[PDB]
Amino acid sequence: IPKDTLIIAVENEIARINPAYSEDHDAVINLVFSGLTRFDENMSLKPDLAKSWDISKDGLVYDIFLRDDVLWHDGVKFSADDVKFSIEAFKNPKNNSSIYVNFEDIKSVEILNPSHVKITLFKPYPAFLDALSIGMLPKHLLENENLNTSSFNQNPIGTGPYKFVKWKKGEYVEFKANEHFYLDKVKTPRLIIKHIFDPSIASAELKNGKIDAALIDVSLLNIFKNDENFGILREKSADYRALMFNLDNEFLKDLKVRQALNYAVDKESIVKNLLHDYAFVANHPLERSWANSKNFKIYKYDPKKAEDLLVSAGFKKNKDGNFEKDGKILEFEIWAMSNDPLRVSLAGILQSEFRKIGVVSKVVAKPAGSFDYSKVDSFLIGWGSPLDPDFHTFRVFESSQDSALNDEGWNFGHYHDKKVDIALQKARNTSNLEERKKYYKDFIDALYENPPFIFLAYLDFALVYNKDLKGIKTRTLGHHGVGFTWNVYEWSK
Ligand SMILES: N[C@@H](Cc1c[nH]c[nH+]1)C(=O)O
Ligand SMILES: [Mg+2]
Ligand code: NI
Numbered sequence: 001i002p003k004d005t006l007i008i009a010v011e012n013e014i015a016r017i018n019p020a021y022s023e024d025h026d027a028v029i030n031l032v033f034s035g036l037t038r039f040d041e042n043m044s045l046k047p048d049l050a051k052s053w054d055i056s057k058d059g060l061v062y063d064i065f066l067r068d069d070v071l072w073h074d075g076v077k078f079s080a081d082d083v084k085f086s087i088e089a090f091k092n093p094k095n096n097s098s099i100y101v102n103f104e105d106i107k108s109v110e111i112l113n114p115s116h117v118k119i120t121l122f123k124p125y126p127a128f129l130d131a132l133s134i135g136m137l138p139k140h141l142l143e144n145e146n147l148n149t150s151s152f153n154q155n156p157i158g159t160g161p162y163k164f165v166k167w168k169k170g171e172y173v174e175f176k177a178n179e180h181f182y183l184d185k186v187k188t189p190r191l192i193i194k195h196i197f198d199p200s201i202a203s204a205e206l207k208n209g210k211i212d213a214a215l216i217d218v219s220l221l222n223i224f225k226n227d228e229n230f231g232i233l234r235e236k237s238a239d240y241r242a243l244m245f246n247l248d249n250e251f252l253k254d255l256k257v258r259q260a261l262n263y264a265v266d267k268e269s270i271v272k273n274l275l276h277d278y279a280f281v282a283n284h285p286l287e288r289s290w291a292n293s294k295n296f297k298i299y300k301y302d303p304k305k306a307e308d309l310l311v312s313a314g315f316k317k318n319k320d321g322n323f324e325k326d327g328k329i330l331e332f333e334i335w336a337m338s339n340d341p342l343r344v345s346l347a348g349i350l351q352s353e354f355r356k357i358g359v360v361s362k363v364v365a366k367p368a369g370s371f372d373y374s375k376v377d378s379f380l381i382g383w384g385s386p387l388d389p390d391f392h393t394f395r396v397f398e399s400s401q402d403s404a405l406n407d408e409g410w411n412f413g414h415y416h417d418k419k420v421d422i423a424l425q426k427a428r429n430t431s432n433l434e435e436r437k438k439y440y441k442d443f444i445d446a447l448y449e450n451p452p453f454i455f456l457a458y459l460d461f462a463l464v465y466n467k468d469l470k471g472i473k474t475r476t477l478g479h480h481g482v483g484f485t486w487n488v489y490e491w492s493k
Pocket of ligand 1: 012025368380381382383479
């Protein structure tokens with residue numbers, strides 16, 4: 001690989017390179033686009049396209065002041081027009097934006113002058129500044145387009161550090177440095193995002209020198225020991241793994257069953273042995289957040305509590321020593337993405353724990369994208385954001401976000417809890433920080449009393465990189481390790 005070219009592998013690919021359809025599962029949107037705000041090495045809110053902002057006392061009015069030295073990749077200037085268009089596009093239900101929920105509380109967007117936009121809200125939404133980091137859209141290209149289907153989505157123009165060059169689908173996306181980047185000089189002139197979902201192949205291509213960097217599963221990490229072409233950077237993350245219950249399932253809809261299944265698992269055993277202390281035991285989805293109550297009940301590893309719960313639910317043990325109810329065995333499937341060894345291994349351990357308490361389960365391992373995980377009995381799932389606590393909680397747990405009911409929802413297990421709904425809505429619409437913490441405490445407590453998941457472990461990630469690489473900075477990563485390329489414009493060899 002030439003010195004003026006950077007090649008990075010990422011596991012997840014997106015169909016539309018457009019902030020409006022961002023699902024925190026990609027690395028290319030933050031390359032092409034830039035938002036009004038951004039985050040530094042410490043996850044602190046920093047100015048990006050917006051040079052500064054003022055927020056009204058009641059949190060309903062945002063005055064945003066824009067930089068005037070920003071160009072779109074087509075040489076067209078960034079202005080307040082783009083901001084009004086972008087935000088109005090996110091809000092428009094006809095665009096089916098994946099980030100619609102972050103913009104739904106917006107009343108109006110006013111252009112006061114070409115560098116000053118005034119945003120008014122129906123209700124407070126303190127995550128708004130975090131939400132505005134997502135990336136602005138070019139008005140002059142998309143004004144007369146169908147955002148859902150526009151060819152723009154496969155030929156994007158943004159204000160980010162990198163320009164779109166060409167896209168080989170299922171292969172790679174190539175970028176070139178934005179010569180007019182306002183924030184900083186983009187160091188490496190060529191950037192290739194290579195799509196590799198198989199970690200063994202990712203490891204092999206590193207050894208081959210076909211790619212410069214990738215996130216490598218901990219089980220494969222020992223392979224790069226003694227290798228001198230590579231350094232290893234350990235990164236913390238808000239990413240957790242869990243078992244998603246499908247509450248449509250005849251057995252998993254029952255509360256007593258889900259509580260019993262939580263009692264059956266020795267998460268410390270899992271973390272210690274399977275993850276080699278590259279993790280810690282998870283109990284709820286906000287344990288890296290300020291919203292963490294650090295004062296919550298847990299389901300502690302206790303098989304007889306588990307078995308006793310199942311009897312209470314009305315299950316009788318049979319001659320095989322497996323629970324049955326009204327003539328039918330307590331049986332369901334555990335699906336895992338076969339391309340993710342950690343998930344397959346976790347599903348395998350879960351199956352073994354469940355049998356020891358007389359629950360029959362079947363592990364189904366299929367490649368990511370080959371099946372609909374919102375229709376399987378249970379699924380080894382993952383989520384987690386280092387940003388506002390609302391971002392991977394509302395779409396994931398709130399009942400209106402049921403994916404069967406909402407095409408842009410992330411509630412794949414069809415979970416419906418009234419207390420979760422109220423707590424998340426009030427938390428996302430409350431300005432006071434301490435009051436927010438109280439509502440997220442309610443949320444966590446509500447999750448305990450009616451578990452949608454079996455929370456398992458928060459993950460650390462390992463970045464394996466060409467040792468010739470300069471300028472890499474670590475920070476708290478999100479789900480799938482998204483964000484490890486956050487400062488890639490500083491990268492050079
Ligand atoms: N984010 C969820 C769903 C998903 C499927 N593929 C990628 N993500 C998970 O990681 O389990
Ligand atoms: Mg950005
Ligand atoms: Ni995911």
